[PDB]
Design a protein around this ligand. Structure first.
Ligand SMILES: [Mg+2]
Ligand SMILES: [Mg+2]
Ligand SMILES: [Mg+2]
Ligand SMILES: [Mg+2]
Ligand SMILES: [Mg+2]
Ligand SMILES: [Mg+2]
Lengths: 92, 129, 156, 199, 142, 86
RNA sequence: CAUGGGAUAACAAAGGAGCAUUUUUAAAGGAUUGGAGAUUAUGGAGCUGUGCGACAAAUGCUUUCCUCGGUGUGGUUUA
RNA sequence: UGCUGUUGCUGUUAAAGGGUUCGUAGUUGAACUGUGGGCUGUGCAGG
């Protein structure tokens, strides 16, 4: 994936948070540059995150895989529903 | 895979001599191959040869006169004390009158007659006649 | 004039944990030698000797505190006979290691060699810290146990 | 004297005639020339030698400089050698970096540790490259004659012939002087296909 | 080719004998090193970096201009891949094969090819552990 | 477990050691309290040996970096003096 | 068992960014005779840092990011 | 008796290549660090 390469880029060089609460926190400020959501997200939480992104004018990416796939892609050995990139590093 | 560069070179030379060629390309080359070729040259069994540099293991073009009957490598390179020369000549050479067993010794690579003159043993590399 | 050299130190628990008191047999650790025949860097009384054959006594033997009655440098165990080299194979035992002597054995009929190995149990003094794969020089001594006939003399 | 900054501090006390003349020429060039003005203030030489190539005319001025200036000298070698030749009539100038050679160890453990750039083959290759710098070696052969001798032939690009062929004899003799090895030169007009030019 | 199969293909590069860079290449060595590090910082492995420099910038060989190979430059700058590039690609292929086989349990040909890829991964990991290019206890997880 | 908890609270062992010894205690590695304590002491002794070796390594690193900085600074000074000689 | 030889080999190590200039003088600081052992102190040689002179350095600190002279029967080099 | 074969056997059809791969001990494993030079005399040296 393109998203996999960009994600590993930011895992090495940028900054991010994992989990919906920390993502929404970075969203409530302007620190977030991109929100990545697993296809596994429960509908109401997905909708809340989309609303926050729409209000903050933050780009939203819908991951193909579920929270397990997203967690593995981020190098993590746990699942993550929502990722927020707060510093893009040397990616884009 | 290729495991002995010397055996490959000597088999190539023997094939070219058997089929009556006047030149043969050897690939790859090494120092031991060059010393063996020089030993054969010193006794007139091959003519002039050229080492081509390719920034790798090089290549050799050997000019063949019709004098070489057969050259081959001995694998493994068996130990040979000064008292084993007669046995090797009996086993691998056409006669006691001509032909050479080539050895690697701590005095360098040479044929068996020169080594016996220096009173040194070593490992058997091959033969030619 | 002897009681003027008597000096009492305290028992340190890093050594004395055997239910019997650990001490060198060759010296009296309570009395200071007037001539400093057996004294370490820190003034403690410690016996040490030079084994022959040009083997240097390790600094930890001269100046350490370990008690080992089988150490060739600080006890009456002496080195005589064979000096062998080997690779350390196991360090699982207390003060004893297993070494391997790998060698080629020639079969005359086939004019070829065979890989063979022997294993020797060796006493290792606390003056050395050998690891698996290290090279060691060992020297033959009197029997120290059912299998041990050698002592570690140097760790490469 | 201002011009002696262009030598090693060792030779500034009692400079030889040729070393002082080369230092003077380098000092004047460090101001007159525009391309040599950008590099020469950091550059200085070790020694200068005269070599008389036999059976010919003209001598060869061998200028020795520290190896740390290799890139500096490479960057302006074509200008520097031409200007120095314009200074000395009837003499060729060849700039050779001073290189140290680590003799081949007799032990397999020391042999594994020697700096490969301090081996004889690498050093001799680099010295010959210095001698002919603007041209590069296009091929290399060793001719092994029936008498046990080995003769090395170095091939250059035939499009460079009109600039180097006249110097090739002096280069061969000076390479023999410095390395105690023989070298012969040939030209190839199609190096990719090993096409040797007969003239 | 030869390892794991009957392929005998010969296709490869033939590096030039004349190693000196062309005279029309007027990019200094330090600028080339900067380009290499910038490419690595955009998540490019040494193979891809070399290919961009060769296709778009006229740098036939980085080592011939700078004196150093690309992975050496990345190591000197802290940009080298955490695990070696070829092992990374083999692990990625094995993972994709396993993902495909999760749904396609009767694709026996892919199971055969997965066995070959994993044996390759173990032989390479053994090599890289021996030359201290990997940690001990580095484990390939299926 | 009560012993391991008390040792963690008093900082006698760190989290990694606590977790390892906890999983080994559940796995019937220690026969009694004194066995666990002796294993803890052995861990601490090996840790002290490693720490001493690493402290020597760090001292060499500091000394070598200092010598390097001094050599570089002296070379810069001498080059400046040579330039001022011109 | 001792020793000469080093060509062919083996063992071990490394995996090349944990890889790091020779000296001079100066100041600043922290065992030996002495009649011989003892004791008890000076006085040093011998440790870092501050200067200074003299060399070097396998890679440039004067850096790197902020028509004419020479050459073989035209070719370079400035113009 | 080269019908036990290291020297030194046989394996398409006479006896004998495992159905095919993978693979651990084992065995085996590519180049490279390297032409010493001058002086005189002497040799069917040779182009
Ligand atoms: Mg039969
Ligand atoms: Mg059959
Ligand atoms: Mg048959
Ligand atoms: Mg049959
Ligand atoms: Mg079957
Ligand atoms: Mg296999």
């Amino acid at each position: 994936d393109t998203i996999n390469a960009k994600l590993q880029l930011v895992m090495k060089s940028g900054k991010y948070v994992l989990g919906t609460q920390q993502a929404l926190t970075t969203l409530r400020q302007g620190r977030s540059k991109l929100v990545v959501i697993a296809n596994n997200c429960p509908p109401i939480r997905r909708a809340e995150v989309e609303y926050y992104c729409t209000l903050s004018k933050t780009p939203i990416h819908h991951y193909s895989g579920n929270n397990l796939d997203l967690g593995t892609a981020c190098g993590k050995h746990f699942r993550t529903c929502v990722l927020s990139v707060t510093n893009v590093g040397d990616s884009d | 895979t290729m495991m002995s560069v010397l055996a490959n070179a000597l088999r190539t030379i023997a094939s070219a001599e058997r089929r009556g060629k006047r030149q043969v390309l050897i690939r790859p080359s090494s120092k031991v191959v060059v010393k063996f070729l020089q030993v054969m040259q010193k006794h007139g069994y091959i003519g002039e040869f050229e080492i081509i540099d390719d920034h790798r293991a090089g290549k050799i073009v050997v000019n063949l006169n019709g004098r070489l009957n057969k050259c081959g490598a001995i694998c493994p390179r068996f130990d040979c004390a000064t008292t084993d020369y007669e046995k090797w000549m009996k086993n691998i050479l056409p006669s006691r009158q001509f032909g050479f067993v080539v050895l690697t010794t701590s005095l360098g690579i040479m044929d068996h007659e020169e080594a016996r003159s220096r009173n040194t043993g070593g490992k058997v590399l091959g033969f030619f006649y | 004039v002897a009681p003027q050299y008597y000096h009492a130190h305290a028992v340190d628990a890093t050594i004395q944990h055997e239910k019997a008191y650990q001490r060198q047999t060759a010296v009296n650790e309570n009395m200071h030698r007037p001539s400093r025949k057996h004294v370490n860097k820190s003034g403690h009384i410690r016996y040490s000797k030079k084994i022959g054959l040009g083997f240097k006594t390790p600094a930890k033997a001269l100046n350490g505190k370990y008690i080992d009655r089988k150490c060739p440098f600080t006890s009456n165990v002496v080195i005589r006979g064979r000096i062998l080299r080997g690779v350390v194979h196991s360090t699982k035992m207390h003060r004893t290691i297993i070494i391997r002597r790998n060698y080629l054995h020639f079969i005359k009929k086939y004019q070829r060699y065979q890989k063979r190995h022997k294993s020797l149990a060796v006493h290792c003094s606390p003056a050395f810290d050998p690891k698996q794969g290290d090279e060691v020089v060992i020297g033959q001594c009197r029997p120290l146990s059912k299998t041990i006939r050698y002592n570690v003399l140097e760790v490469v | 004297q201002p011009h002696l900054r262009k030598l090693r501090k060792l030779k500034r006390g009692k400079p030889s005639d040729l070393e002082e003349s080369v230092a003077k020429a380098l000092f004047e060039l460090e101001a007159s020339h525009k391309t040599l003005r950008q590099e020469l203030p950091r550059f200085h030489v070790n020694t200068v030698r005269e070599v008389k190539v036999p059976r010919s005319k003209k001598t060869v001025l061998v200028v020795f400089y520290p190896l740390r200036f290799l890139m500096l000298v490479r960057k302006v070698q074509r200008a520097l050698t031409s200007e120095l030749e314009k200074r000395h009539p009837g003499c060729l100038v060849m700039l050779v970096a001073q290189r140290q050679i680590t003799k081949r160890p007799t032990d397999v453990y020391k042999l594994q540790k020697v700096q490969r750039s301090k081996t004889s083959t690498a050093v001799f290759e680099n010295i010959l490259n210095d001698m002919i710098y603007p041209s590069d070696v296009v091929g290399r052969r060793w001719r092994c004659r029936t008498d046990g001798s080995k003769l090395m032939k170095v091939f250059l690009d035939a499009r460079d012939r009109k600039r180097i062929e006249s110097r090739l004899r002096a280069v061969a003799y000076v390479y023999k002087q410095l390395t105690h090895r023989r070298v012969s030169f040939g030209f190839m007009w199609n190096p990719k296909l090993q096409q040797v030019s007969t003239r | 080719v030869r390892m794991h199969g009957n392929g005998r293909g010969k296709a490869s590069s033939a590096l030039p004998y004349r190693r000196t860079p062309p005279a029309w290449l007027k990019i200094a060595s330090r600028n080339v090193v900067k380009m290499v590090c910038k490419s690595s910082r955009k998540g490019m492995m040494p193979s891809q970096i070399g290919m961009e420099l060769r296709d778009s910038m006229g740098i036939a060989q980085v080592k011939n201009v700078t004196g150093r190979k690309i992975l050496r430059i990345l190591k000197h700058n802290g940009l080298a891949p955490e695990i070696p590039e070829d092992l990374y690609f083999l692990v990625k292929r094995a993972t994709q094969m396993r993902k495909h086989l999760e749904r396609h349990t009767t694709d026996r040909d892919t199971k055969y090819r997965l066995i070959l890829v994993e044996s390759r991964i173990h032989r390479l990991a053994r090599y890289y552990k021996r030359v201290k290019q990997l940690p001990p206890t580095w484990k390939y997880e299926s | 477990r009560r012993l391991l908890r008390k040792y963690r609270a008093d900082k006698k062992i760190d989290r990694h050691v606590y977790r390892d010894l906890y999983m080994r205690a559940k796995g019937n590695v220690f026969r009694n309290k004194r066995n666990l304590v002796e294993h803890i002491h052995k861990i601490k002794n090996e840790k002290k040996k490693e720490r001493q070796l690493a402290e020597q390594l760090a001292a060499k690193h500091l000394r070598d970096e200092q010598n390097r900085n001094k050599a570089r600074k002296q070379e810069l000074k001498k080059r400046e003096k040579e330039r001022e000689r011109a």
